[PDB]
Amino acid sequence: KNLRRIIRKIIHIIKKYG
């Protein structure tokens, strides 16, 4: 939740956003 979800948030934000 801290920075974990973030690590996966990248492939997400990038995909979702990026």
Side-chain angles (χ1 to χ4, degrees):
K1 60 212 212 162
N2 269 47
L3 250 279
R4 291 245 184 174
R5 302 185 109 75
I6 305 200
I7 222 316
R8 346 189 118 192
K9 194 125 84 138
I10 44 117
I11 203 164
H12 182 128
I13 295 336
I14 300 160
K15 251 237 291 118
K16 212 322 196 239
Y17 238 114

Tab-separated table of all heavy atoms in Angstrom:
chain	number	residue	atom	x	y	z
A	1	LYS	N	0.840	-1.185	0.000
A	1	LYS	CA	0.000	0.000	0.000
A	1	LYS	C	0.885	1.248	0.000
A	1	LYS	O	0.586	2.226	-0.684
A	1	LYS	CB	-0.995	-0.048	1.162
A	1	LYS	CG	-0.267	-0.127	2.504
A	1	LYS	CD	-1.081	-0.926	3.524
A	1	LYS	CE	-0.850	-0.402	4.942
A	1	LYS	NZ	-1.928	-0.860	5.846
A	2	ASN	N	1.956	1.175	0.777
A	2	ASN	CA	2.887	2.286	0.875
A	2	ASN	C	3.410	2.633	-0.521
A	2	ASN	O	2.875	3.519	-1.185
A	2	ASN	CB	4.086	1.924	1.753
A	2	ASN	CG	3.828	2.292	3.214
A	2	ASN	OD1	2.785	2.005	3.779
A	2	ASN	ND2	4.832	2.944	3.794
A	3	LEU	N	4.449	1.917	-0.923
A	3	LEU	CA	5.051	2.138	-2.227
A	3	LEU	C	4.918	0.867	-3.067
A	3	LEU	O	5.347	0.832	-4.220
A	3	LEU	CB	6.492	2.629	-2.077
A	3	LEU	CG	6.748	4.087	-2.462
A	3	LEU	CD1	6.889	4.237	-3.977
A	3	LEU	CD2	5.662	5.003	-1.894
A	4	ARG	N	4.322	-0.147	-2.458
A	4	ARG	CA	4.126	-1.418	-3.135
A	4	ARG	C	3.213	-1.238	-4.350
A	4	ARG	O	3.646	-1.415	-5.487
A	4	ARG	CB	3.513	-2.456	-2.194
A	4	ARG	CG	4.509	-2.868	-1.108
A	4	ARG	CD	4.903	-4.339	-1.254
A	4	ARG	NE	5.796	-4.736	-0.142
A	4	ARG	CZ	6.216	-5.991	0.072
A	4	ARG	NH1	5.826	-6.977	-0.747
A	4	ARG	NH2	7.024	-6.259	1.107
A	5	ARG	N	1.967	-0.888	-4.065
A	5	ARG	CA	0.990	-0.682	-5.120
A	5	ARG	C	1.559	0.241	-6.199
A	5	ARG	O	1.164	0.161	-7.362
A	5	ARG	CB	-0.299	-0.072	-4.565
A	5	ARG	CG	-0.908	-0.966	-3.484
A	5	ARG	CD	-2.264	-0.427	-3.025
A	5	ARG	NE	-3.349	-1.310	-3.505
A	5	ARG	CZ	-3.629	-2.511	-2.979
A	5	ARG	NH1	-2.905	-2.978	-1.954
A	5	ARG	NH2	-4.634	-3.243	-3.479
A	6	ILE	N	2.478	1.096	-5.777
A	6	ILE	CA	3.107	2.033	-6.692
A	6	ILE	C	3.936	1.259	-7.718
A	6	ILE	O	3.774	1.449	-8.923
A	6	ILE	CB	3.908	3.082	-5.919
A	6	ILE	CG1	3.028	3.798	-4.892
A	6	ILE	CG2	4.589	4.065	-6.873
A	6	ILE	CD1	3.643	5.138	-4.482
A	7	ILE	N	4.806	0.403	-7.203
A	7	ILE	CA	5.661	-0.401	-8.060
A	7	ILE	C	4.835	-0.956	-9.222
A	7	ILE	O	5.324	-1.050	-10.347
A	7	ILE	CB	6.376	-1.479	-7.244
A	7	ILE	CG1	7.842	-1.606	-7.666
A	7	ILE	CG2	5.636	-2.815	-7.333
A	7	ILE	CD1	7.975	-1.601	-9.190
A	8	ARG	N	3.596	-1.308	-8.910
A	8	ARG	CA	2.697	-1.852	-9.914
A	8	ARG	C	1.841	-0.737	-10.519
A	8	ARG	O	1.210	-0.927	-11.557
A	8	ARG	CB	1.782	-2.921	-9.314
A	8	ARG	CG	2.288	-3.366	-7.940
A	8	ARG	CD	1.513	-4.587	-7.440
A	8	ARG	NE	2.430	-5.737	-7.278
A	8	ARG	CZ	2.026	-7.000	-7.085
A	8	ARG	NH1	0.717	-7.284	-7.030
A	8	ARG	NH2	2.930	-7.980	-6.948
A	9	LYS	N	1.845	0.402	-9.841
A	9	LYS	CA	1.077	1.547	-10.299
A	9	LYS	C	1.694	2.087	-11.590
A	9	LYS	O	0.996	2.669	-12.420
A	9	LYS	CB	0.961	2.593	-9.188
A	9	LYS	CG	-0.110	3.632	-9.523
A	9	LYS	CD	-1.140	3.741	-8.397
A	9	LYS	CE	-0.651	4.685	-7.296
A	9	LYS	NZ	-1.752	5.561	-6.838
A	10	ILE	N	2.995	1.876	-11.720
A	10	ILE	CA	3.714	2.335	-12.896
A	10	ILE	C	3.129	1.665	-14.141
A	10	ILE	O	2.648	2.343	-15.048
A	10	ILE	CB	5.218	2.109	-12.727
A	10	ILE	CG1	5.503	0.724	-12.142
A	10	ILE	CG2	5.849	3.225	-11.892
A	10	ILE	CD1	6.309	-0.129	-13.122
A	11	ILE	N	3.186	0.340	-14.143
A	11	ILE	CA	2.667	-0.429	-15.261
A	11	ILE	C	1.171	-0.150	-15.415
A	11	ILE	O	0.567	-0.521	-16.421
A	11	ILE	CB	3.002	-1.912	-15.093
A	11	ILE	CG1	2.997	-2.632	-16.442
A	11	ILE	CG2	2.061	-2.575	-14.085
A	11	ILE	CD1	3.701	-3.987	-16.342
A	12	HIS	N	0.615	0.502	-14.405
A	12	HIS	CA	-0.799	0.834	-14.415
A	12	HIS	C	-0.990	2.249	-14.966
A	12	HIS	O	-1.662	2.439	-15.978
A	12	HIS	CB	-1.411	0.653	-13.024
A	12	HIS	CG	-2.894	0.927	-12.965
A	12	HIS	ND1	-3.802	0.029	-12.433
A	12	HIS	CD2	-3.617	2.008	-13.377
A	12	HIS	CE1	-5.015	0.556	-12.524
A	12	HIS	NE2	-4.898	1.783	-13.110
A	13	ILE	N	-0.385	3.204	-14.275
A	13	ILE	CA	-0.480	4.596	-14.683
A	13	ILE	C	-0.020	4.730	-16.136
A	13	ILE	O	-0.655	5.421	-16.931
A	13	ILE	CB	0.289	5.492	-13.710
A	13	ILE	CG1	-0.344	5.460	-12.317
A	13	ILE	CG2	0.405	6.918	-14.253
A	13	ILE	CD1	-1.819	5.059	-12.394
A	14	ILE	N	1.081	4.057	-16.440
A	14	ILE	CA	1.633	4.092	-17.783
A	14	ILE	C	0.612	3.512	-18.764
A	14	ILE	O	0.407	4.058	-19.847
A	14	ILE	CB	2.992	3.390	-17.822
A	14	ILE	CG1	3.988	4.071	-16.882
A	14	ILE	CG2	3.522	3.303	-19.255
A	14	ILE	CD1	5.147	3.134	-16.539
A	15	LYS	N	0.000	2.412	-18.350
A	15	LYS	CA	-0.995	1.753	-19.179
A	15	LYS	C	-2.299	2.551	-19.137
A	15	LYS	O	-2.860	2.885	-20.179
A	15	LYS	CB	-1.155	0.290	-18.761
A	15	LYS	CG	-0.570	-0.650	-19.818
A	15	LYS	CD	-1.625	-1.641	-20.314
A	15	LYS	CE	-1.985	-2.650	-19.222
A	15	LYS	NZ	-3.413	-2.526	-18.853
A	16	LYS	N	-2.744	2.833	-17.921
A	16	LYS	CA	-3.972	3.585	-17.729
A	16	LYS	C	-3.780	5.008	-18.256
A	16	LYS	O	-4.620	5.518	-18.997
A	16	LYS	CB	-4.414	3.525	-16.266
A	16	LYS	CG	-5.940	3.559	-16.151
A	16	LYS	CD	-6.547	4.497	-17.196
A	16	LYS	CE	-7.996	4.843	-16.846
A	16	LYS	NZ	-8.906	4.424	-17.935
A	17	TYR	N	-2.671	5.610	-17.853
A	17	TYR	CA	-2.359	6.965	-18.276
A	17	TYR	C	-1.360	6.960	-19.436
A	17	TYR	O	-1.720	7.269	-20.571
A	17	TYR	CB	-1.714	7.646	-17.067
A	17	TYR	CG	-2.448	8.904	-16.597
A	17	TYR	CD1	-3.069	8.921	-15.365
A	17	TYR	CD2	-2.490	10.021	-17.407
A	17	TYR	CE1	-3.760	10.105	-14.924
A	17	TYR	CE2	-3.181	11.204	-16.966
A	17	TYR	CZ	-3.782	11.189	-15.746
A	17	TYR	OH	-4.434	12.307	-15.328
A	18	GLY	N	-0.125	6.608	-19.110
A	18	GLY	CA	0.928	6.560	-20.110
A	18	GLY	C	0.364	6.185	-21.483
A	18	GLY	O	0.629	6.865	-22.473
